């Protein structure tokens, strides 16, 4: 109806309704009164000029009042007047800067000096946890933010519908020289190119893909070719195994694996004109492959194998052990007198596992 200080008759939406005392103050009397309080009075004098309802000699309501009054003070005062309000509040009330919170839902900023761990945004009126800033719900009560954050990501239907594709995407590819983490699946292609440092490496074992005449490995027979050297438990080799034999290594060590979902939805980064377009794998998803394609299901099996440091050499036949001996020990094996095939096999196996460790830079877990 009219301003409670000067009587000027304005509509209700043309004045400032003080959220505490419910008084309608004209924009001019509001501004002039509060600044002169900053100018020559004290901060306990920041009460409504008409009424006086905020008791400033009372440490009960002092902080929640300035929290709400700060909003209207920001919109009505000048920049220098608003700065003295924070300086005097810091130097006379809090002995520190006020806790300013940004509502993640509507982008509003406000002072929050209450003891509760949940805060109500004065603008959108939604409540959120002060630490993790996610939307507050009853499930968060008595639970750490991580527990709560993991609980929502775990039961969001869109996340669960992706299936094992998320596990493949989440296990990142870290460039061994520039340390950039790409967080992509591998599929069937091991030769990785890093955009930042141009390093070429194997995404399964992080060994270098050497250019022509650059490989320094002794007894390398493809020095004039682009190539890398891989440990025996690198996906580069284990991708050639059938899913059945990969599962047998997991079963021999009591490691569980999915074969049904918990084309292929695994996201790949295809290069388009100026940019990368995330195009899904989309290849056939056979039964027993947990909703993935074959290459992505084998990658999933191998990362389980690598995470548990399972040794594929435990399943090698004699000819496999002989290949492994020449590849990694650089000696052609040969049976000795009195040895039957199992004894020969047991000897080659013991020497290989003692001298050649599993992938030393393979990402495990």
């Amino acid at each position, epitope marked *: 109806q009219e301003c409670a200080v000067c009587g000027w008759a304005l509509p209700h939406n043309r004045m400032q309704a003080l959220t505490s005392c419910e008084c309608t103050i004209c924009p001019d009397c509001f501004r002039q009164h509060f600044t002169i309080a900053l100018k020559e009075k004290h901060i306990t004098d920041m009460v409504c000029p008409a009424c006086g309802r905020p008791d400033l000699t009372d440490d009960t309501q002092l902080l929640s009042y300035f929290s709400t009054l700060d909003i209207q003070l920001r919109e009505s005062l000048e920049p220098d007047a608003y700065a003295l309000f924070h300086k005097k509040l810091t130097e006379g009330v809090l002995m520190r800067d006020p806790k300013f919170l940004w509502c993640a839902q*509507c*982008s509003f900023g406000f002072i929050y000096e209450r003891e509760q761990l949940e805060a109500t945004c004065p*603008q959108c009126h939604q409540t959120f946890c002060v630490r993790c800033k*996610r939307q507050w719900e009853e499930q968060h009560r008595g639970r750490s933010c991580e527990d709560f954050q993991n609980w929502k990501r775990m039961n969001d239907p869109e996340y669960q519908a992706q299936g094992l594709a998320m596990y493949l995407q989440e296990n990142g590819i870290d460039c061994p020289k520039c340390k950039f983490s790409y967080a992509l699946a591998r599929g069937g292609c091991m030769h990785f190119h890093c955009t930042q440092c141009r390093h070429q490496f194997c995404s399964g074992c992080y060994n270098a893909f050497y250019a022509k005449n650059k490989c320094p490995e002794p007894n390398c027979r493809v020095k004039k070719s682009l190539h890398g050297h891989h440990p025996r438990d690198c996906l580069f080799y284990l991708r050639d195994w059938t899913a059945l034999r990969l599962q047998k290594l997991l079963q021999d060590n009591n490691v569980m694996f999915n074969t049904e979902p918990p084309g292929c939805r695994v996201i790949e980064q295809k290069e388009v004109p100026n*940019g990368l377009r*995330d195009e899904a794998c989309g290849k056939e998803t056979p039964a027993g492959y947990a909703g993935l394609c074959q290459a992505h299901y084998k990658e999933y099996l191998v990362s389980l194998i690598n995470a548990h440091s399972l040794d594929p050499a435990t399943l090698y036949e004699v000819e496999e052990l002989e290949t492994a001996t020449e590849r990694y020990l650089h000696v052609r094996p040969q049976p000795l007198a009195g040895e039957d095939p199992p004894a020969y096999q047991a000897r080659l196996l013991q020497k290989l596992t003692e001298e050649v460790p599993l992938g030393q830079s393979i990402p495990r877990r």
Partner: nanobody
Amino acid sequence: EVQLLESGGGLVQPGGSLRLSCAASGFTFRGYSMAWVRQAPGKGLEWVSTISPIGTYTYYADSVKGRFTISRDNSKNTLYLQMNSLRAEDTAVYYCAKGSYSRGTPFDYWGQGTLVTVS
């Protein structure tokens, strides 16, 4: 990682129409609120509008409410700003912004911007 690419800015006469787009990638788009801000020539940054993660709620600055309409397409990871009845004060570089759950800021990423001129 995170990227926000704005497009749709240009020259337009007063009372005209213009629709900006912000293509988002590198994060779960549907799980964050998004916003439009703008910087008029020589002036300070100004907030324009914010939209909720799934679009239930929209918020607008006073000078643009009713003229501008914010919207999003989570199927495409794209954020839109439909600007109607442009004025001369609307000339500015426009930026889309990703809502942030980190303490200390309401947004943690801004695009490279798109220039709008109203002659």
